[PDB]
A paper describes a structure:
We devised a method that we call pre-stabilization of a GPCR by weak association (PSGWAY) to purify Ste2–LF because of its inherent instability. The structures were determined by single particle cryo-EM to overall resolutions of 3.1 Å (ligand-free) and 2.7 Å (Ste2–Ant), with two separate structures of Ste2–Ag determined to resolutions of 3.5 Å. Mutation of F2045x28 and N2055x29 in this region abrogates both ligand binding and signalling, highlighting the importance of the conformational change. Agonist binding to the ligand-free inactive state of Ste2 causes reorientation of the extracellular end of H5 to facilitate ligand binding, an outward movement of the extracellular end of H6 and a shift of ECL3 (Ste2IL–Ag state), resulting in a contraction of the orthosteric binding site by an average of 27%. The dimer interfaces are smaller in ligand-free Ste2, Ste2–Ant and Ste2IL–Ag (2,166 Å2, 2,138 Å2 and 2,145 Å2, respectively) compared with Ste2AL–Ag and Ste2–Ag–G (2,727 Å2 and 2,519 Å2, respectively).
Numbering used by the authors:
A (entry chain B), B (entry chain A): 5 to 303
Amino acid sequence: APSLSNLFYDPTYNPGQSTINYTSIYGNGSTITFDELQGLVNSTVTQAIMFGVRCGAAALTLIVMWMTSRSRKTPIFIINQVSLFLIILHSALYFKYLLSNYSSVTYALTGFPQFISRGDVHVYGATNIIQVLLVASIETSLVFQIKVIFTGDNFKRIGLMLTSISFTLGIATVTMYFVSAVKGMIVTYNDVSATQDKYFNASTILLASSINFMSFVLVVKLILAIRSRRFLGLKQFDSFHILLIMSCQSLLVPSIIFILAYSLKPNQGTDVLTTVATLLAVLSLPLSSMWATAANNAS
Amino acid sequence: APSLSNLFYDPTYNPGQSTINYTSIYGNGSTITFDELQGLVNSTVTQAIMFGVRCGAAALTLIVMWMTSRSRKTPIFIINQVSLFLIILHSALYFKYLLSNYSSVTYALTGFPQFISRGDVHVYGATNIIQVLLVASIETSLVFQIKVIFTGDNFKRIGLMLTSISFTLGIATVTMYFVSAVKGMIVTYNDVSATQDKYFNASTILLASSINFMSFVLVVKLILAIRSRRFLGLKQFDSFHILLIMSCQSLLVPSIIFILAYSLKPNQGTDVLTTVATLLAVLSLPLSSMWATAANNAS
Ligand SMILES: CC(C)CCC[C@@H](C)[C@H]1CC[C@H]2[C@@H]3CC=C4C[C@@H](OC(=O)CCC(=O)O)CC[C@]4(C)[C@H]3CC[C@]12C
Ligand SMILES: CC(C)CCC[C@@H](C)[C@H]1CC[C@H]2[C@@H]3CC=C4C[C@@H](OC(=O)CCC(=O)O)CC[C@]4(C)[C@H]3CC[C@]12C
Ligand SMILES: CC(C)CCC[C@@H](C)[C@H]1CC[C@H]2[C@@H]3CC=C4C[C@@H](OC(=O)CCC(=O)O)CC[C@]4(C)[C@H]3CC[C@]12C
Ligand SMILES: CC(C)CCC[C@@H](C)[C@H]1CC[C@H]2[C@@H]3CC=C4C[C@@H](OC(=O)CCC(=O)O)CC[C@]4(C)[C@H]3CC[C@]12C
Ligand SMILES: CC(C)CCC[C@@H](C)[C@H]1CC[C@H]2[C@@H]3CC=C4C[C@@H](OC(=O)CCC(=O)O)CC[C@]4(C)[C@H]3CC[C@]12C
Ligand SMILES: CC(C)CCC[C@@H](C)[C@H]1CC[C@H]2[C@@H]3CC=C4C[C@@H](OC(=O)CCC(=O)O)CC[C@]4(C)[C@H]3CC[C@]12C
Ligand SMILES: CC(C)CCC[C@@H](C)[C@H]1CC[C@H]2[C@@H]3CC=C4C[C@@H](OC(=O)CCC(=O)O)CC[C@]4(C)[C@H]3CC[C@]12C
Ligand SMILES: CC(C)CCC[C@@H](C)[C@H]1CC[C@H]2[C@@H]3CC=C4C[C@@H](OC(=O)CCC(=O)O)CC[C@]4(C)[C@H]3CC[C@]12C
Ligand SMILES: CC(C)CCC[C@@H](C)[C@H]1CC[C@H]2[C@@H]3CC=C4C[C@@H](OC(=O)CCC(=O)O)CC[C@]4(C)[C@H]3CC[C@]12C
Ligand SMILES: CC(C)CCC[C@@H](C)[C@H]1CC[C@H]2[C@@H]3CC=C4C[C@@H](OC(=O)CCC(=O)O)CC[C@]4(C)[C@H]3CC[C@]12C
Ligand SMILES: CC(C)CCC[C@@H](C)[C@H]1CC[C@H]2[C@@H]3CC=C4C[C@@H](OC(=O)CCC(=O)O)CC[C@]4(C)[C@H]3CC[C@]12C
Ligand SMILES: CC(C)CCC[C@@H](C)[C@H]1CC[C@H]2[C@@H]3CC=C4C[C@@H](OC(=O)CCC(=O)O)CC[C@]4(C)[C@H]3CC[C@]12C
Ligand SMILES: CC(C)CCC[C@@H](C)[C@H]1CC[C@H]2[C@@H]3CC=C4C[C@@H](OC(=O)CCC(=O)O)CC[C@]4(C)[C@H]3CC[C@]12C
Ligand SMILES: CC(C)CCC[C@@H](C)[C@H]1CC[C@H]2[C@@H]3CC=C4C[C@@H](OC(=O)CCC(=O)O)CC[C@]4(C)[C@H]3CC[C@]12C
Ligand SMILES: CC(C)CCC[C@@H](C)[C@H]1CC[C@H]2[C@@H]3CC=C4C[C@@H](OC(=O)CCC(=O)O)CC[C@]4(C)[C@H]3CC[C@]12C
Ligand SMILES: CC(C)CCC[C@@H](C)[C@H]1CC[C@H]2[C@@H]3CC=C4C[C@@H](OC(=O)CCC(=O)O)CC[C@]4(C)[C@H]3CC[C@]12C
Ligand SMILES: *[C@@H]1O[C@H](CO)[C@@H](O)[C@H](O)[C@H]1NC(C)=O
Ligand SMILES: *[C@@H]1O[C@H](CO)[C@@H](O)[C@H](O)[C@H]1NC(C)=O
Ligand SMILES: *[C@@H]1O[C@H](CO)[C@@H](O)[C@H](O)[C@H]1NC(C)=O
Ligand SMILES: *[C@@H]1O[C@H](CO)[C@@H](O)[C@H](O)[C@H]1NC(C)=O
């Protein structure tokens, strides 16, 4: 402490409106305020919390699903059990990515391509292939959940139509994700400082559409089940409806979050409401798998 | 892009060794390198991941413990069930704290006390009372686990000695945590820019000691159980030993992590190895509670 300045005794002085002087690719003499630096830091601090929550939840839900399910040879169990493992691998590679030199303030303020080494683009390119494999696992899980609902001979002509509207949309989603990943990765590899390509996010709208379709099918199945269990002399649910609606056995909340996500503007948290919705869909698929496979009008 | 400088064509130029020019309390003209700024940012990015993992794990382990335990009126269940809730409340208040103005780069580089408002010290002071209540819950859980082991009349003179060495150490731990919190909070309230007081971390050594004592008691109980189940004509464990040793039914891994934590220097991750060890102890207490209460030599 050599000498304290006059600014230490000004009650109306506002730090954060001061100016940082720095050197960039456009020559020495660039300037920024402290609030833009803090806004750059707060987005990394905000997107590390979500992926830590994802890694923790999926890691502790894998063990629980092993120790609690009794029949462990069905395909639906295996697919639900590898989706959480791709969640954990995605979170691990994202943790590696966030502490490297490609998501730092140094690169952001000073856009020097000398700071990026070969390997950072490979950790940034493996993540976009883990994402496509996680989406493929979710879509195949949904298709397997649609197959088992209409196994009986009550409606053997609506089930094939629904399988044909839930199959095409899953290869549409996995194809728009592989084309977006290969088209972002050719650009990223060619030049390190380049704008990533987006297509009206025409991939999260397809994922949303698929999950909305699943919600629709399960609600329709419940409405049909009530009418089936009244014409025949059987009892009817009293407090079981609230479980099969609000307890994510119909994928209702993960299908409200995505349609509040792709409707609102980027200002109100568009990039935050999709990571939570993917986590919620992946965690809610073991619940929807128990209702879909269940018998419609059994004791 | 007005004009690109010569530094864009130097292969040997190293960004990060450049210098930031800023204004501080010691007058205008202070300087720092980009690597110290990135070192300040990386510690916040590293300590948000751990608390996100804590919030996720505890939040999804609370629901599972409710839906899976059959008897839900024992005291041990209630204490184990409120410890995870204090973990979630601690994580929530820490998430609020990390995005405020007290953990920012602006305050760090420019130590102006005008940037801190009344309320940030209250969010920084509630956290140190949630920590003391979490520690109190852990200690009372351990004392209740010690009480139930020696309920029988085989050894009615060793159990009271162990309860008297596990009770005094728990009020010692909760008292050193309340005195450290009140003594850090009087200083923090008096002046916002002040050094926090430490006492050779003489609180994490006590927590470690208590958990080590629990590990010791449970290993002793297993060794005694084998000798009890041999003299009498009863069967013996074949692959159950590895469960009761390596599967955290004896608190072994949470008691190795703390003694690798308070032994190593602060350079090798002392502040990282204690948050993981507290999470592991809190998650492993439902396992240790099933062995301790279990009958020693029953079928
Ligand atoms: C079902 C189980 C696994 C629990 C799931 C809980 C999540 C839905 C919660 C827990 C922690 C929450 C996060 C805690 C803190 C923040 C920071 C918050 O940031 C701000 O709004 C302030 C700073 C800024 O403006 O960026 C945005 C929401 C977010 C990511 C929250 C999003 C929702 C999360 C992930
Ligand atoms: C990639 C990440 C998730 C880390 C990898 C962790 C695995 C090495 C762990 C996590 C879940 C574990 C499984 C969780 C549950 C079981 C069932 C368990 O058997 C039983 O509990 C039933 C039969 C019996 O009672 O013995 C045998 C071990 C196993 C397969 C575990 C083997 C080791 C696994 C695969
Ligand atoms: C889901 C379960 C199975 C955990 C999976 C963890 C992996 C995603 C992690 C664990 C070890 C990691 C590796 C550990 C070390 C390195 C070297 C590292 O080398 C560097 O260039 C950076 C360090 C340096 O500059 O020397 C590049 C990433 C890599 C391959 C890491 C890639 C990500 C890995 C494979
Ligand atoms: C199911 C549960 C028990 C998790 C099982 C898997 C773990 C053993 C894996 C999953 C994620 C892994 C982590 C993912 C990322 C990192 C960051 C990595 O950091 C680096 O070395 C690069 C960044 C830098 O230091 O600059 C070190 C390994 C570590 C902690 C990995 C250690 C091993 C972890 C915890
Ligand atoms: C857990 C199961 C599903 C296997 C998945 C493991 C992957 C997460 C690992 C295995 C091979 C790894 C890759 C092996 C080699 C490299 C090159 C490596 O190049 C470097 O810059 C570091 C080494 C060097 O300096 O040459 C960067 C990481 C990368 C892409 C690794 C990224 C992480 C990968 C894909
Ligand atoms: C709305 C926000 C504030 C979250 C509230 C907490 C949820 C994460 C909890 C509260 C109710 C819970 C549900 C209540 C009951 C069940 C039935 C349970 O299945 C059974 O026990 C068998 C069927 C039966 O007992 O009827 C599976 C978990 C689930 C869906 C629970 C999942 C987790 C839920 C949604
Ligand atoms: C099944 C259980 C776990 C569901 C719990 C309810 C969630 C769906 C809610 C509870 C908290 C909510 C968050 C609370 C605060 C915010 C900040 C909010 O921020 C803004 O509006 C502007 C700031 C910005 O995002 O940049 C955006 C929505 C979000 C992430 C909310 C998203 C929806 C969340 C995660
Ligand atoms: C979006 C929110 C609701 C997610 C919250 C976390 C879920 C992924 C967890 C928390 C509660 C768990 C449930 C708690 C209790 C049960 C009952 C359990 O039933 C049995 O053990 C049946 C055994 C037999 O078949 O005889 C099967 C797992 C299940 C549905 C669990 C599945 C995983 C759940 C839904
Ligand atoms: C039992 C269930 C709930 C799984 C628990 C997993 C944790 C034990 C793992 C998951 C994520 C891990 C973290 C992922 C990344 C990092 C960064 C890693 O690298 C550095 O920070 C290096 C130094 C630096 O660059 O600052 C240090 C370990 C740490 C905090 C890991 C610590 C161990 C964590 C919390
Ligand atoms: C902020 C953090 C602490 C999360 C708080 C979420 C609560 C609103 C949730 C989490 C666990 C839930 C409980 C989990 C299990 C049950 C048992 C459940 O019992 C049943 O009738 C169904 C299962 C059975 O038959 O045993 C009734 C709801 C209840 C108390 C749930 C009520 C709502 C709770 C407390
Ligand atoms: C763990 C579960 C059971 C409960 C978690 C609840 C918390 C996440 C909430 C409850 C009360 C909330 C606080 C209520 C009021 C405020 C004051 C609010 O505004 C101010 O600080 C004053 C105005 C100003 O900023 O000038 C900032 C958020 C904060 C600390 C809130 C932060 C989030 C808190 C701690
Ligand atoms: C039902 C179970 C899964 C528990 C769910 C808990 C959530 C409802 C809580 C826990 C942590 C909370 C978060 C903790 C901290 C923050 C930062 C806080 O930041 C601010 O913007 C503060 C106000 C301001 O300064 O403007 C906004 C609310 C938020 C995201 C909270 C939103 C509500 C959350 C996600
Ligand atoms: C869920 C059950 C266990 C109850 C726990 C509720 C907490 C989440 C609440 C109760 C008291 C609250 C605190 C009461 C008072 C304050 C002071 C307040 O400071 C102000 O800026 C207020 C005005 C001033 O004093 O200048 C900031 C929020 C805080 C710490 C509150 C944070 C949220 C707390 C801890
Ligand atoms: C990161 C690497 C080192 C893998 C870590 C894997 C652990 C997180 C797993 C592997 C073995 C698991 C244990 C295997 C068996 C049991 C017994 C189980 O209790 C029973 O006796 C029930 C058995 C059943 O229901 O089939 C409780 C969970 C526990 C301790 C498991 C807890 C989680 C453990 C330690
Ligand atoms: C019982 C099951 C849940 C497995 C638990 C595994 C953990 C006990 C391991 C796995 C990953 C380990 C971490 C991997 C990497 C690091 C970075 C390492 O960093 C250094 O040595 C120097 C850099 C720094 O100061 O951070 C310190 C230990 C730590 C946190 C390790 C601590 C011990 C961890 C959390
Ligand atoms: C990294 C280590 C510390 C494990 C972290 C996760 C634990 C907190 C979870 C994972 C597996 C869970 C166990 C999985 C299965 C069981 C058997 C279950 O047995 C019953 O009484 C119900 C019937 C049955 O499922 O067999 C009781 C809960 C318990 C011990 C669970 C307690 C909580 C455990 C240990
Ligand atoms: C930062 O940039 C401006 C140029 O507009 C200059 O006036 C100022 O002297 C520089 N340095 C400081 C410490 O303010
Ligand atoms: C900084 O900028 C001025 C003009 O842009 C230039 O003359 C000078 O060489 C640069 N470097 C230093 C160290 O002043
Ligand atoms: C930053 O501080 C040093 C003082 O040692 C000065 O030489 C330099 O001109 C300042 N500004 C820049 C842009 O380098
Ligand atoms: C910056 O520092 C010098 C000497 O320390 C001082 O004369 C000057 O008033 C300060 N402010 C500006 C804007 O140059």
